[PDB]
């Protein structure tokens, strides 16, 4: 989140005004809460699961401009997290198909599975 908020809210862009909503099932520790207090007007957090469509309804995913899926690039099993992030794309496209999803894949064949999704 720190590296994301550095590259996203950088002053070298124009006067951006999008808000950043986060969605994670694990509750944040005290350092993440201090980071969200450092960005009190630009960043909101909401604890939930992206697979559960009630939590997608909570973050207003139907009116969001885009949805971003960060990956754990140092995971122990790359096919496992590629499977999990593919499941996240399936869930968001199951709720709202007309959204723009940006994601990260760790192999190329798991990227090839994403084009088979009907949305």
């Amino acid at each position: 989140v720190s590296n994301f908020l550095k590259d996203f809210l950088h002053k070298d862009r124009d006067d951006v005004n999008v808000e950043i909503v986060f969605l994670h099932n694990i509750s944040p520790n005290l350092e993440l809460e201090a980071l969200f207090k450092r960005h009190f007007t630009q960043v909101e957090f909401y604890q939930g699961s992206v697979l559960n469509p009630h939590d997608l309804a909570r973050v207003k995913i139907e009116s969001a401009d885009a949805c971003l899926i960060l990956a754990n690039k140092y995971c122990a099993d790359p096919d496992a997290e590629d499977a999990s992030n593919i499941m996240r794309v399936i869930s968001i496209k199951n709720y709202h198909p007309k959204i723009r999803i940006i994601t990260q894949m760790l192999q190329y064949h798991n990227k090839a599975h994403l084009l088979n999704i009907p949305s």
Binding site: L51, A83, M87, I90, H113, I117, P118
Partner: peptide
Amino acid sequence: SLQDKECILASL
């Protein structure tokens, strides 16, 4: 979380 991952991917 992904027990039915393969079957859902094959269906889609």
